[PDB]
Amino acid sequence: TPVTVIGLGLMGQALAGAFLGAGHPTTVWNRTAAEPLVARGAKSAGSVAEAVAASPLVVVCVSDYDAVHALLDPLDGTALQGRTLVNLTSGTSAQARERAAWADGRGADYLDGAILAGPAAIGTADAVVLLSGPRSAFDPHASALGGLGAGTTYLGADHGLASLYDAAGLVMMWSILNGFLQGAALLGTAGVDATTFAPFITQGIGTVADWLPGYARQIDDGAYPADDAAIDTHLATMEHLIHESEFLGVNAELPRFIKALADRAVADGHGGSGYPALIEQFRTH
Amino acid sequence: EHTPVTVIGLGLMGQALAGAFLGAGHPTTVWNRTAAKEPLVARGAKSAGSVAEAVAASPLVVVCVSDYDAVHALLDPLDGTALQGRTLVNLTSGTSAQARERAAWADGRGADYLDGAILAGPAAIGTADAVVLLSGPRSAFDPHASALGGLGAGTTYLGADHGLASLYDAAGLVMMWSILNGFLQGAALLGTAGVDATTFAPFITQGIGTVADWLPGYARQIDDGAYPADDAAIDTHLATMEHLIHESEFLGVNAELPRFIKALADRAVADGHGGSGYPALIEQFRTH
Numbered sequence: 001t002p003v004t005v006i007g008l009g010l011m012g013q014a015l016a017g018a019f020l021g022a023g024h025p026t027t028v029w030n031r032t033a034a035e036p037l038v039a040r041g042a043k044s045a046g047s048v049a050e051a052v053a054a055s056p057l058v059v060v061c062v063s064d065y066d067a068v069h070a071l072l073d074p075l076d077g078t079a080l081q082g083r084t085l086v087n088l089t090s091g092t093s094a095q096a097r098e099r100a101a102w103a104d105g106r107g108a109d110y111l112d113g114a115i116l117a118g119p120a121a122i123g124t125a126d127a128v129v130l131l132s133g134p135r136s137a138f139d140p141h142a143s144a145l146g147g148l149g150a151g152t153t154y155l156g157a158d159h160g161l162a163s164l165y166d167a168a169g170l171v172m173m174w175s176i177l178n179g180f181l182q183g184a185a186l187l188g189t190a191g192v193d194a195t196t197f198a199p200f201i202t203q204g205i206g207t208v209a210d211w212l213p214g215y216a217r218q219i220d221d222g223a224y225p226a227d228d229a230a231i232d233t234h235l236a237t238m239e240h241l242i243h244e245s246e247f248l249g250v251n252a253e254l255p256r257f258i259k260a261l262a263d264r265a266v267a268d269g270h271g272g273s274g275y276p277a278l279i280e281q282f283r284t285h
Numbered sequence: 286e287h288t289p290v291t292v293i294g295l296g297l298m299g300q301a302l303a304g305a306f307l308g309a310g311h312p313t314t315v316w317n318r319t320a321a322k323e324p325l326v327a328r329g330a331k332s333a334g335s336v337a338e339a340v341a342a343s344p345l346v347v348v349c350v351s352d353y354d355a356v357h358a359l360l361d362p363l364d365g366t367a368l369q370g371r372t373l374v375n376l377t378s379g380t381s382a383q384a385r386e387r388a389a390w391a392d393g394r395g396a397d398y399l400d401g402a403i404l405a406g407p408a409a410i411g412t413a414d415a416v417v418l419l420s421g422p423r424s425a426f427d428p429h430a431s432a433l434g435g436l437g438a439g440t441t442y443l444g445a446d447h448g449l450a451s452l453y454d455a456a457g458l459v460m461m462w463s464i465l466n467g468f469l470q471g472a473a474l475l476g477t478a479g480v481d482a483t484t485f486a487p488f489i490t491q492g493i494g495t496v497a498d499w500l501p502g503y504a505r506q507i508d509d510g511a512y513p514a515d516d517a518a519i520d521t522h523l524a525t526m527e528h529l530i531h532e533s534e535f536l537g538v539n540a541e542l543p544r545f546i547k548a549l550a551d552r553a554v555a556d557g558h559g560g561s562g563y564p565a566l567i568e569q570f571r572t573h
């Protein structure tokens with residue numbers, strides 16, 4: 001099964017590498033042409049149009065959806081007819097949904113994706129690559145695409161999903177790093193080093209993560225039982241976190257933000273509910 | 286051993302504590318404002334007439350009540366002699382300043398003092414799931430180490446400062462609220478497309494594990510003043526944070542959290558740490 005890869009930054013190379021390493025006749029193109037991939041078995045290509053004509057499966061990985069626009073919008077109406085396009089460029093759900101409409105009007109199958117791992121992980125069990133789009137676009141190329149890693153996974157029909165998953169993962173990542181930093185600062189005031197702190201906090205991170213499947217069950221019904229842990233009882237402790245932060249002269253913006261949300265929930269009379277009732281705060285504005 | 290211990294305060298957590306001390310074979314005296322709050326004296330527990338009697342019963346006294354204002358209310362009125370020669374362990378939640386205050390007070394009252402914090406629910410007490418942090422001087426902790434281990438294998442002594450247990454509790458709490466809020470932001474986003482929280486959860490917990498593994502390394506960076514980019518500099522985060530905001534606004538979900546995240550990164554860029562790795566943001570968390 002021949003496959004084409006458009007875009008050869010760090011990630012584009014990894015992608016092409018995995019397709020060669022899995023035995024695919026692999027055609028390649030980049031703006032700045034120029035090499036190692038053609039030195040393994042890769043056929044290099046003269047233009048974008050030649051790259052697209054080479055394979056029924058076309059993969060795109062460039063910096064943003066503006067670059068995607070730049071390389072794909074100029075193509076002939078016929079160039080994509082009957083082909084499957086897989087766009088692994090990072091972007092928003094709206095960008096993905098747009099390319100899906102565009103690709104449909106250009107007579108093509110389209111999968112929108114997102115890579116959640118570094119270039120080194122591609123082709124291993126560490127790779128996570130999410131795909132969204134219709135089954136008719138994915139099933140025929142499932143074997144080919146599995147070549148990027150066992151973590152290559154199909155999320156469902158709506159082309160917006162990969163983006164949304166990538167967003168949920170990113171906000172969680174920033175949330176954790178910032179929580180960690182707030183912690184290290186606090187403890188640093190008493191001279192405890194970050195490296196002493198870390199093993200403590202990773203144990204705790206694991207504990208909290210185990211609570212989430214249950215919080216998900218609560219969110220999927222509209223049912224937020226207190227379980228001796230109601231939002232009201234969090235409130236006092238959040239004040240302490242703020243007072244402690246202020247008093248030691250570290251930043252308190254994060255603790256104050258945390259208290260703000262809980263106050264809102266109390267103000268809509270959800271004081272008596274479990275923490276996951278805060279989903280309503282995250283749903284509005 | 287049959288080494289006697291007293292427990293003052295019998296809310297959910299106070300009961301669990303007293304339960305663990307009985308279950309470990311300790312002659313266990315008990316007191317609560319709302320007396321008869323009973324099942325404990327129905328196991329082998331001796332109940333007590335007043336706070337003073339409870340303190341006179343045991344060389345080891347443990348306190349677990351709602352806040353340090355309550356602690357003030359029950360302990361300040363005692364005679365100067367009532368605590369002489371005893372070890373007081375306060376497992377009430379509070380601030381480092383509240384802990385350091387009681388340590389001074391307890392010292393002037395002729396007592397050894399450990400300040401602690403419980404990081405687990407009542408059910409976990411007496412098991413391997415219990416985490417109970419203790420801080421204070423070795424002289425206060427060593428002679429009662431066996432007794433206190435009876436609360437769980439996760440019972441741990443943090444060192445001399447009477448403020449450390451509070452500070453560890455704070456770090457753990459802020460991390461906990463940070464993760465839950467991240468999770469809720471995610472669920473709201475994915476909810477717009479009809480994907481259920483329970484579908485989402487296994488995806489996010491895989492990721493949480495991946496990020497946690499980065500932290501020992503981030504700690505090493507923070508402990509030197511050295512924040513190398515590792516092909517992942519704060520500048521390169523910046524574009525993506527804008528997308529998270531634009532996505533949030535556009536789908537009509539809350540965007541305060543994504544905006545807050547971008548705010549901090551902007552500050553770091555404005556002090557010319559754009560080129561550094563993410564852990565250079567510790568400086569933002571250390572000021573204002």
Ligand SMILES: NC(=O)c1ccc[n+]([C@@H]2O[C@H](COP(=O)([O-])OP(=O)(O)OC[C@H]3O[C@@H](n4cnc5c(N)ncnc54)[C@H](OP(=O)(O)O)[C@@H]3O)[C@@H](O)[C@H]2O)c1
Pocket residue numbers: 006007008009010011012030031032033061062063064066067070071088089090091115116117118119
């Ligand atoms: N590497 C990672 O850590 C990682 C992880 C997950 C996802 N991703 C995503 O993968 C995608 C690719 O990133 P990358 O690793 O390739 O980083 P990158 O090196 O910045 O991307 C470079 C690729 O984009 C092309 N490009 C950029 N602007 C262009 C334009 N106006 N016209 C034509 N081509 C343009 C570059 O062509 P030139 O030859 O002209 O430079 C090159 O092919 C990005 O969405 C990135 O977010 C990356």
Ligand SMILES: NC(=O)c1ccc[n+]([C@@H]2O[C@H](COP(=O)([O-])OP(=O)(O)OC[C@H]3O[C@@H](n4cnc5c(N)ncnc54)[C@H](OP(=O)(O)O)[C@@H]3O)[C@@H](O)[C@H]2O)c1
Pocket residue numbers: 294295296297298299317318319320322349350351352354355358359376377378379403404405406407
């Ligand atoms: N349970 C948990 O999930 C958990 C987890 C970690 C830490 N903790 C901590 O454990 C400590 C105790 O909380 P808990 O869960 O046992 O709370 P609780 O169910 O509110 O029990 C609170 C205790 O506070 C006492 N109290 C409050 N004000 C008082 C006063 N002015 N004078 C005398 N006694 C007073 C109550 O006695 P009355 O019954 O007579 O009112 C009761 O024994 C708290 O600091 C809490 O943060 C609890």
